[model samples]
Target: YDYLFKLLLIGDSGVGKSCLLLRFADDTYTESYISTIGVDFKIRTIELDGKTIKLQIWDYRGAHGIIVVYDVTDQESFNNVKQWLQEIDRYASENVNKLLVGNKCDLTTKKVVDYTTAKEFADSLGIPFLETSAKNATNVEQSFMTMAAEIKKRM
Candidate 1:
């Protein structure tokens, strides 16, 4: 079966937002996605568990409404999830498939949000959580894959 997942890549600017999108969308590294202001997007087709999956990712500015991003190191980004939840309440559908991602997991420094906390937060939000490192390309494929599978199952 085929399905489309509309996901938003949001977080503080300069947090590798574009890199994550390009890595997933093109499966390659980009010089800098920073040049595109406000909103930029991309589409990618992936094969997961023998199913074709397409992702329509919306990369938005963090200053705008409904700001949610994954942070492997920044506590402020993790804290912003609640604000995003509020935005979802005001602007999004009740059943929107929200993905809480902690990008740049390749860093060697200690993380601000541990895996356990991220999982718990996702559970509380009633959504799925993922930690991805688009730079190293680790779990980048599976991140979209699992999210697509979940979206399909919901359908």
Candidate 2:
């Protein structure tokens, strides 16, 4: 790989952070719930502009890019995005790129957060926003690729 970037996934419990990582890194998904103890790690090498880039994605931990995720079906998880952003501000690098993600978009019937609302919130914070479903693998690749490209531009 020509470049290696560390990315962090932060969100409230049950927002499918781990599942997102799994779907992105391994192209796999599981229905059973598994609690993430401390931090989990995964890696995937991707091609961007004919250059090989290795992405090291972490579940809880300078991260070149941070993906703050929320469950579209869970309003409380969506509300906790602010606190996650605060934590990123407090602990991450000042110039780290950020992506706001609304996960579980597959559950449309149970969805409590809408795309426009999330998009507006992310715009207010000056971060890119995406809605994804790890279960259905919707935007799973694009989400990581978007972050990778953003980080590469900064690099």
Best by TM-score: 2
CA error at residue 106 for candidate 2, angstroms: 0.8
lDDT of 1: 0.68
Every model's TM-score = 0.79, 0.94
Candidate 1, poorest ten consecutive residues by summed lDDT: 60-69
Predicted candidate 1 versus true structure: per-residue lDDT over 1-155, tens digit per residue = 36566777557665666777777777777555467634456767777768776667776322111225657788777787777677666666555556677887877576777889888978986777778887888877776666676667667
Instruction: State which candidate has the highest lDDT.
Output: 2
Alpha-carbon RMSD to native, per candidate: 4.3, 1.8
- Candidate 2 lDDT tens digits, 44-88: 899999989999888823689999999999999999999998888
